[PDB]
């Protein structure tokens, strides 16, 4: 299962409480809030909340979205194998195929340093 420890370390790498109420475009598309959720991710997690900006600026609604996204795409990305936090963090960063993409390994390494207290 996608755990609170996994979620917390994804939050930390994305900016977490410092991004409550905030959106930005510096990553290359619009990303909002403590988990830096983009609009297609909010569509894919089931459009929780009052709207994209309303949900993803808010920590609790963002966590509803992330949890739904991991439940929906985790075993999709792994092809049926039980997912781990490595898979969940890599699909947060890279999309539903992210757990297989070399481009998300660096992101997992940052999450894993949080899980190790580095
Ligand atoms: Cl793991
Ligand atoms: Cl790469």
Numbering used by the authors: 21 to 138
What do the authors of the reporting publication say about this deposited model?
To get structural insights into destabilase function we solved its structure in two different crystal forms: P1—obtained at pH 5.0 and high sodium salt concentrations (2.9 M sodium malonate) and P21—obtained at pH 8.0 and low sodium concentration (0.3 M sodium chloride). In the low salt structure, the Gly44-Ser51 loop is bent outward with Asp46 exposed to the bulk solution. Val47 backbone forms a H-bond with an adjacent protein molecule, and therefore crystal packing contributes to stabilization of “open” conformation of the Gly44-Ser51 loop. Our low salt structure lacks the sodium ion but contains cryoprotectant glycerol molecule, H-bonded with Glu34 but not Asp46. Surprisingly, all three amino acid residues in the isopeptidase site of destabilase do not form hydrogen bonds to each other in both high and low salt structures. We expect it is because both our structures were substrate-free.
Destabilase from the medical leech Hirudo medicinalis belongs to the family of i-type lysozymes. It has two different enzymatic activities: microbial cell walls destruction (muramidase activity), and dissolution of the stabilized fibrin (isopeptidase activity). The main difference between low and high salt structures as well as between the two chains of high salt structure is tied to a flexible loop (Gly44-Ser51), containing enzymatically important Asp46. Together with Glu34, Asp46 forms a catalytic dyad for muramidase activity in i-type lysozymes.
